[PDB]
Ligand binder design. Sequence first.
Ligand SMILES: FC(F)(F)c1cc(NCc2cnc(-c3ccc(Oc4ccccc4)cc3)s2)ccn1
Length: 206
Amino acid sequence: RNLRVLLDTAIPPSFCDTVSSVLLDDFNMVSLIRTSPADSLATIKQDNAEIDIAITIDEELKISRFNQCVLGYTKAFVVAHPQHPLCNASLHSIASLANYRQISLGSRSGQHSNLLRPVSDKVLFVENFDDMLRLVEAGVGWGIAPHYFVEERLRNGTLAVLSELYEPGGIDTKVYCYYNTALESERSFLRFLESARQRLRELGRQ
Ligand SMILES: FC(F)(F)c1cc(NCc2cnc(-c3ccc(Oc4ccccc4)cc3)s2)ccn1
């Protein structure tokens, strides 16, 4: 009937709004929460919070009271400041990157998903992407960010990309939809999945 829905901050706005309208058509009351992917799963697991659907890039199989399925995809970029050493290098390996400071989401204390697990031994953590980019643009290091976030800075030369040999066009990242088990049998939920997936496909095409 009613729904509390979490969407992590790597899910682009177009994607969010898509999920929003589908859920508002197929459900009654809809509430949204936004969190960094580092805190996405960590949030829903709290028995205290009552989140019924959670849409995030963070991977985790067997979570209590929740299912998993794939809703769509999003693309992320390895970015650094344009005069950063790694940009004047052209060549790319994960070791070349590991010898420099990563600016990464998450808190050092705690189980870091293999997704947000820093690659460098020299890391500097942040709470959100705004802060991450503050440091990157100040040449303090390099980071991983959503496309929608850094599109602007890349258009404007503010910011470079280090991932264009690894995966041209950025790094495809699954978007998982962890759904409370009680919804498995709700035809409203199944309709939502169907419609949101179709729309997101038509959108990814564009
Ligand atoms: F949310 C968000 F921001 F999109 C986001 C998505 C994520 N997805 C999974 C990945 C985690 N590490 C990825 C990665 C890192 C460094 C790479 O370096 C290079 C460079 C050039 C040649 C070879 C290797 C390549 C791939 S991909 C992770 C974190 N954050």
